[PDB]
């Protein structure tokens, strides 16, 4: 029952400092290498750093992108691993995973003393968003069905949910009565630092102008709720 649980994540502004925590359960924490890996939105995994066990001197080492700005520390008495971050930048926005690492000995004679290092157990991750944006509710615009949004006998319609911060927004159609054929896209981060997404649905062209379509947009961080009727 080896378990790792990260916490401390959230919103923070560029230039500021933040500490992430990871508590380990079900293993002898004091005896292990421990570390951190991150994944920026839409990107791959990236190693952040590691710390050796206290018995071997507790040296911490870091990935190239974070050296000089982060410190990894440990408190074996509490089975807790820390990532102390400073001088944060927008590109540090990522999910941060805590890892229990191991080194397996290399058995080729000429490489004795060497080891294979790997991330053996990972936590589910804590999200850090680094941004100078302030809370802003979305503007909702219709994506109206017309001849240009018809394919065969199918019409597409939707809502563009633009310029909000922070995530997330939720979208439903007709108060949840319409789910068939709906796609609500993942949000993108725009150059402005505000998020945007669209939600669309495809329907028979024969349904237009009899059937009502209303998108229901909720943004809990601004406590805003918007219903937008979408007409041809």
């Amino acid at each position: 029952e080896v378990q790792l649980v990260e916490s401390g994540g959230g919103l923070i502004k560029p230039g500021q400092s933040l500490t992430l925590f990871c508590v380990g359960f079900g293993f002898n924490f004091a005896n292990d290498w421990m570390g951190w890996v991150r994944q920026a939105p839409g990107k791959g995994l990236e190693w952040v750093g590691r710390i050796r066990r206290l018995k071997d001197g507790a040296k911490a080492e870091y990935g190239s992108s974070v050296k000089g700005r982060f410190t990894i520390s440990r408190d074996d008495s509490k089975n807790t691993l820390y990532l102390h971050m400073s001088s944060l930048k927008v590109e540090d926005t990522a999910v941060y995973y805590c890892t229990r690492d191991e080194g397996a000995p290399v058995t080729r004679f000429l490489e004795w003393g060497s080891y294979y290092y790997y991330m053996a157990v990972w936590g589910k991750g804590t999200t850090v968003t680094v941004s100078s944006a302030s809370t802003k509710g979305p503007s909702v615009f219709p994506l109206a069905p017309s001849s240009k949004s018809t394919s065969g006998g199918t019409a597409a319609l939707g809502c563009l949910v633009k310029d909000y911060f922070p995530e997330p927004v939720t979208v439903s159609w007709n108060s949840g009565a319409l789910t068939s054929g709906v796609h609500t896209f993942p949000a993108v981060l725009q150059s402005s630092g505000l998020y945007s997404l669209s939600s669309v649905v495809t329907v028979p062209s024969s349904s237009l102008g009899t059937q009502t379509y209303i998108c229901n947009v909720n943004h809990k961080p601004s406590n805003t709720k918007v219903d937008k009727r979408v007409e041809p």
Binding site: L45, A104, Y118, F141, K148, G152, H183, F185, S198
Partner: protein
């Protein structure tokens, strides 16, 4: 200093298939390679270390091979739980870099499906806000690869669009994609023709949806 490049970037597989993912290292690193599996919404999982050593608890259907600069992860008898993104990682340097490959997506194979393509001009209400978003929708297609290119008055557009793609549908195994072109009201007011061109495997020729302002 060590860079790992995986190929292909994406693979389609049916249950029972054998899938091969390659990792090429920019320099010789003996057998100092790890492989990980990552499904979205769950923690990454170690599969293999030392290029070929299977981690305890992992199915023997995963096999790692290679030494030097070329490494392979083979997934035999692929099972539904194997649809995921896979990463190689080097652990060669004494002063660690622990560089990862860029990842390879393995998704569920289905019959090729061309996208239905739709275009939306900006709403009148949005123009008043100072921005015009034009949206091109690619609906229910497979495989995931799609090229979407914008033209305004026959000029290629660079740097002013963003794409978003759904996860693979759990029922029909398709994807949908939006491409949104953003311009200021001032620029939308000038130009006349707006067009998105779509290239997908399910079509022998590209599809263009276009409109003229007004």
């Amino acid at each position: 200093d060590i860079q790992l490049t995986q190929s292909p970037a994406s693979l389609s597989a049916s249950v029972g298939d054998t899938v091969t993912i390659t990792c090429r290292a920019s320099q010789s690193i003996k057998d100092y390679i790890n492989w990980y599996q990552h499904k979205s919404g769950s923690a990454p999982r170690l599969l293999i270390y030392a290029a070929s050593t299977l981690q305890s608890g992992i199915s023997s259907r995963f096999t790692g091979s290679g030494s030097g600069t070329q490494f392979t992860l083979t997934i035999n008898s692929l099972q539904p739980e194997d649809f995921a993104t896979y990463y190689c990682q080097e652990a060669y340097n004494t002063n660690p870099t622990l560089s990862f490959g860029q990842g390879t997506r393995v998704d569920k194979k289905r019959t090729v499906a061309a996208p239905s393509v739709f275009i939306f001009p900006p709403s009148d209400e949005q123009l008043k806000s100072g921005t015009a978003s034009v949206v091109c929708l690619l609906n229910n297609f497979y495989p995931r690869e799609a090229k979407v290119q914008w033209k305004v008055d026959n000029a290629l557009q660079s740097g002013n669009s963003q794409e978003s793609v759904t996860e693979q549908d759990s029922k029909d195994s398709t994807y949908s994609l939006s491409s949104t072109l953003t311009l200021s009201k001032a620029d939308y007011e000038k130009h006349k023709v707006y067009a998105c061109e779509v290239t997908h495997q399910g079509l022998s020729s590209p599809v263009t949806k276009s409109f003229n302002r007004g």
